[PDB]
Amino acid sequence: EVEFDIPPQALGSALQEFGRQADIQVLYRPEEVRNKRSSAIKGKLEPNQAITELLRGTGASVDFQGNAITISVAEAADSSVDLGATMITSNQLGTITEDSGSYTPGTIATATRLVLTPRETPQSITVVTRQNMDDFGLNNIDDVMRHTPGITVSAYDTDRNNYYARGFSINNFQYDGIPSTARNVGYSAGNTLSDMAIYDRVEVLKGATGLLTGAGSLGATINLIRKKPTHEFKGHVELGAGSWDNYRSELDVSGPLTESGNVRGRAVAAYQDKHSFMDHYERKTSVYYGILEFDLNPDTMLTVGADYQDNDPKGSGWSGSFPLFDSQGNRNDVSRSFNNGAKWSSWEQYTRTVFANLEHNFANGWVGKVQLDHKINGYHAPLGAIMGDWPAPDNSAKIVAQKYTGETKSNSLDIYLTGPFQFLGREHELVVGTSASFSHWEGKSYWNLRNYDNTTDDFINWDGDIGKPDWGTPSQYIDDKTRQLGSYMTARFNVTDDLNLFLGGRVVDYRVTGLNPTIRESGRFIPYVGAVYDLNDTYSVYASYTDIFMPQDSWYRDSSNKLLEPDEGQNYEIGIKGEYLDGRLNTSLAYFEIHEENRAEEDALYNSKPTNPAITYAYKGIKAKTKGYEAEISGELAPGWQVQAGYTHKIIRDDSGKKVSTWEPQDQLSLYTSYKFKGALDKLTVGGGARWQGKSWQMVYNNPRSRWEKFSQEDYWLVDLMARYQITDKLSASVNVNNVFDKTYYTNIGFYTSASYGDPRNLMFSTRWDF
């Protein structure tokens, strides 16, 4: 029951104002509300009474679908059925997943910046909703990714994780639809450690995502949707304790800050201090987030926000957790508690964002948005760990220590327009936008240590006890300035009642200046072709042609010292999507092929006998091809029964025919279900899940035995259990059991001739108090 103040006006304006005031996504067709007016509403009425009062005399009907509503004007005659009708939306980011109760989303704008339902999206879109995160205790993005169908989380060391989709490493992140500067695979800056306390959902769009990303990787884009201020007061305190001294605390507060409700705010603060199943390891994390929304008038809204996150570990590992082989070339046998990192070893990662947004509703149903962001993504990594073919026969080992310190400051500006347009008596939608980004990366690297004794007598009983070195002076410097300029346009034509065509593209300008030679790339086109055909009320078939490129490094040049053409690829997709129970349940089945061009490969022939003095180590561009399929189900199976399940099959082979990205399994399966009891057991929720993955391998070089070996991980199952009890209206307690059957497995399969183990069986106990 909220306070509503909307005067009699054009119906479409009233619906956009109601959407803001009720904190609800309002969908309506622009042609249907065209010459109609709203009736006046003022006072503290429930949202249901409010819309029935607002619509009085319009002849419109409402479809209540959780955190969204669809307005329709029914007519005396049979109305022609057009499921994909162009619709005006109140929330440009999609439907809010918080308090929905579902594992499936509503609308999402993550593909083409148009607010579409998953069925309307001619692409592979997977979303991890707020309830899924609450239910399975997914505190960070790594936990989220481990629970995301078609994602493989592979680790380098304790604080360096990498995500794989469709044979490619995902290097793309977006925050509220605004893309973050393309992450360096090794120089963790903080994206892979994003705490979930400040977000509503995570949207993972798979394939070739260039249209809204610009320059980036293949496989997917991870869009994180921040939590937002509300028109009614709501908040919570949540404390948690789990295996290996893992303590967590979270506070979230949201509501109006003035009597009229013109000013609204949300502030969230979280703290986690944990130890590990791994020796001499501890990490401290702090998140702070604050956002203010101002209504300048009923059509204009200004937003100012900021967020902070610091990740501070001690005892950070480096290459893996242990060496694969001993000095003699025999395979090592270490316990899951083994940690190679010295006590003082740390890969410290931090992030801060300061954003301001301006949103306007124009008289023609069009809405304009302006987004200004200032981001920081740094790291302070004085690393040190047992590294190399160790132990030696006298159970001796050697420590390798290097320090990396870097920071990336980014200033981005993003203006875009979205609205309906008529053409040959039919309603279509268009997106036109421009973007500009200015990024600066400074970094120092220390590897010439002063007078350091890097030997340890005991390897088996390694405690992490070695002194810290005098790092000396920087051995290498990075000072890179990047300027990326974009322009996009996407049209969604409502061709017939059963056919909707997507045509769009992006033009990219990219320039990098620094200590190395200037990289200049102008007029880089990224196409977008999509279509959706309604078979019937439930099913729709789709097909898409999408693309993306990544400007290569100044290090990736050919023999003629000319830089390699950008690493790029096309996603060719055919599929079928289902929609049941008024969109409360969604199913999909798709076939994909990723065509890659300019995959940098070492030029062995040149590199063995280099002839040009300008280039000492050159590269060669090759082609690669992923072929696969994916099936997915999410949402209500029954009235209180929910699911998020998926199956993915993938093979990536290069130009020669050889399989590549072999550590990512060809087959993977995920299922996460929960059931809320009815009647007397109403306060009890029970849940569970299981994740299976096929055989994964990697070729490793055995230096002591001068031979290549195949390091494999056989297929394995991981089972999670869950339960929650609502003790009081305000207080609830939960328990979460992960790796229920305590399986031993690997997260790192031979990277840096080292391995890492996945978490042993662990539990998390949490209690939550809602105000």
Partner: protein, 195 residues
């Protein structure tokens, strides 16, 4: 292991011996910072000094070293160390010439190799900078690079020595004919006086 071959041999005067490898080409190299740079640079500085101080120790005393090679071959052939006889001077010259030619062949084998960064004359000057660039660019293990740079510098330093040894043998060979010419001149003079 760097071995200095003082005695004449088919193998280069300064030899670098390395362990065999099957890791020359790796299908995939992990993106991000290389952990081998620090230790790679440390291993380079260790080997480079032992190879440089082996070259300069030899240039210092190359006159005695090469005349000692000549003296081993001289005695290995039954000739005495000090040569006065006409038969002995002529026999001794051939050894000097045979040694000179062997060194000439060895020097020509190094010099007549296809041109690349490794074979450049300025390579010793450019080796440390080039090596570090290769470690930074490849992000892979130093082993193959280090073995190549040292084997290529063993040859560079062997070519410097061989070039100088030929100069020593040309002067030794010239002096030999002078003794021979004057010796036969004096045998002639004396034979005419005995008549």
């Amino acid at each position: 292991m760097v071995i200095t071959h003082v005695q004449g041999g088919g193998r280069d005067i300064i030899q670098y011996i390395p362990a065999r490898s099957s890791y020359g080409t790796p299908p995939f190299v992990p993106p991000g910072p290389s952990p081998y740079v620090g230790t790679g640079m440390q291993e380079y500085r260790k080997l480079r000094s032992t190879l440089d101080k082996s070259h300069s120790e030899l240039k210092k005393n190359l006159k005695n070293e090469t005349l000692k090679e000549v003296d081993e071959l001289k005695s290995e052939a039954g000739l005495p160390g000090k040569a006065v006889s006409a038969n002995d001077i002529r026999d001794e010259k051939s050894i000097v010439d045979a040694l000179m030619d062997a060194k000439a062949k060895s020097l020509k084998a190094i010099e007549d190799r296809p041109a690349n960064l490794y074979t450049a004359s300025d390579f010793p000057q450019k080796s440390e900078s080039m090596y570090q660039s290769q470690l930074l660019a490849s992000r892979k293990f130093y082993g193959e690079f280090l073995d190549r740079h040292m084997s290529e510098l063993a040859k560079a330093y062997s070519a410097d020595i061989y070039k100088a040894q030929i100069a020593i043998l040309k002067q030794t060979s010239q002096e030999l004919e002078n003794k021979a010419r004057s010796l036969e001149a004096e045998a002639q003079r004396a034979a005419a006086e005995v008549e």
